[PDB]
């Protein structure tokens, strides 16, 4: 009875990683490579560079042969937007990003789980099958150490790599609990806020 | 290892039902009574009546002895607000509702799952442990038949009553799929849009 997203293709799908800060530390490259994804990572992209690359990945016909898609984005930004490496106050809207992968603009992934994991650093029907995890943290953390991976990326890597058989949603609940516990022990500026929004229609497990 | 919210008290908690339309049809009263909740239902409340009652339920000291809280609200409203039976265009903000049950204003439910299931009809740290399911539907459905329960309430009742051992989140995923399938077969005005937002930190199952 219980429906589950088909997850059998080899690779499971493409995992697009855009790290505009430099602290992703291969954590998710290694994690998703280990889960069976084909990872392509890019560094030092401006907003225009981000759109160029996102546009190209949304158009690949090889998605047709894959069961899912993963996108990891690490960037400075505002609420609901990313700046890439640009010094700006009007960033690339996040909704414009997910918009590029909706069924109409991206037929090849129609009916397939499209997962977005975003680490943002800020200054203090066609929409079914999307998984959108957004972590916001204070920009001061980058001034202190821009090469140190956020706890969100570390925890995400740990959970997916160590418990790939549990549903993604259940792992994310534990990540929620993990971030809440961290937040309760540190100063305001060291905290991580995690927002999750999804339109999944079936149980999603990143493995066979 | 896997954490799960404590669910053993008798009753599991209070289930507050506010039906300002008249179509709840005892579906959730029966469902939650069957799961072990003490149900209290109110009808024909204005925005002021809704706040009066919500305020009283947020203050009950008996929550101290319960493991959770459930609130079902059925009302005409705007986006993110409910009018109760008032003819108005500025309703009671939904965020003002959840605000009344946060840890600071509601210590007795601190660390406990607070579940809100809302059916709205519209014209075309302190925040951990909240589960917020909001269904929006077109007001024209009430003109046609204000006593007919929405499919959202019917499906919710069916899932919880027939599969009380599965986590609430997994049931809600199936409800998502159920609503998407319904939406794909009918006209715009008969559709139901479901928005889910939560801050759960552990697996939530409404039974022992």
From Swiss-Prot, chains A, B:
Q: From the UniProt entry, list the residue stretches annotated as the region Interaction with CASP3.
A: 1-164
Q: What post-translational events are described?
A: Proteolytically processed by CASP8 generating subunit p43 and p12.
Q: Where is the stretch described as Caspase?
A: 24-119
Tissues showing expression:
Widely expressed. Higher expression in skeletal muscle, pancreas, heart, kidney, placenta, and peripheral blood leukocytes. Also detected in diverse cell lines. Isoform 8 is predominantly expressed in testis and skeletal muscle.
Instruction: Cite the residue spans of the region called Interaction with TRAF1 and TRAF2.
Output: 1-208
Residue ranges of the region described as Interaction with CASP8:
125-208
On assembly, the entry states: TNFRSF6 stimulation triggers recruitment to the death-inducing signaling complex (DISC) formed by TNFRSF6, FADD and CASP8. A proteolytic fragment (p43) stays associated with the DISC. Also interacts with FADD, CASP8, CASP3, TRAF1, TRAF2 and Bcl-X(L) (in vitro). Interacts with RIPK1. (Microbial infection) Interacts with HBV protein X.
Write the protein's name. Answer: CASP8 and FADD-like apoptosis regulator
Q: From which organism does this entry originate?
A: Homo sapiens (Human)
The organism's taxonomy opens as: Eukaryota, Metazoa, Chordata, Craniata, Vertebrata
What's the name of its gene? Answer: CFLAR
Section covered of the full-length record: 240 to 479 of 480
């Amino acid at each position: 009875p219980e429906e589950r997203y088909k997850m059998k293709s080899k690779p499971l799908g493409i995992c697009l990683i855009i790290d505009c800060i430099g602290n992703e530390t291969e954590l998710l490259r290694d994690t998703f490579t280990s889960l069976g994804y084909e990872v392509q990572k890019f560094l030092h992209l401006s907003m225009h560079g981000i759109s160029q690359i996102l546009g190209q990945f949304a158009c690949m016909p090889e998605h047709r042969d894959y069961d899912s898609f993963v996108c990891v984005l690490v960037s400075r930004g505002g609420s609901q937007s990313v700046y890439g490496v640009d010094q700006t106050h009007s960033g690339l809207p996040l909704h414009h990003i997910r918009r590029m992968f909706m069924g109409d603009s991206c037929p090849y992934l129609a009916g397939k789980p499209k997962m977005f994991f975003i680490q943002n650093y800020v200054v203090s029907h066609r929409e079914a099958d999307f998984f959108w995890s957004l972590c916001t943290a204070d920009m001061s953390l980058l001034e202190q150490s821009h090469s140190s991976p956020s706890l969100y990326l570390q925890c995400l890597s740990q959970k997916l790599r160590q418990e790939r058989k549990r549903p993604l949603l259940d792992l994310h609940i534990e990540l929620n609990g993990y971030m809440y516990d961290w937040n309760s022990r540190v100063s305001a500026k060291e905290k991580y806020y995690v927002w999750l929004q999804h339109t999944l229609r079936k149980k999603l497990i990143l493995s066979y």
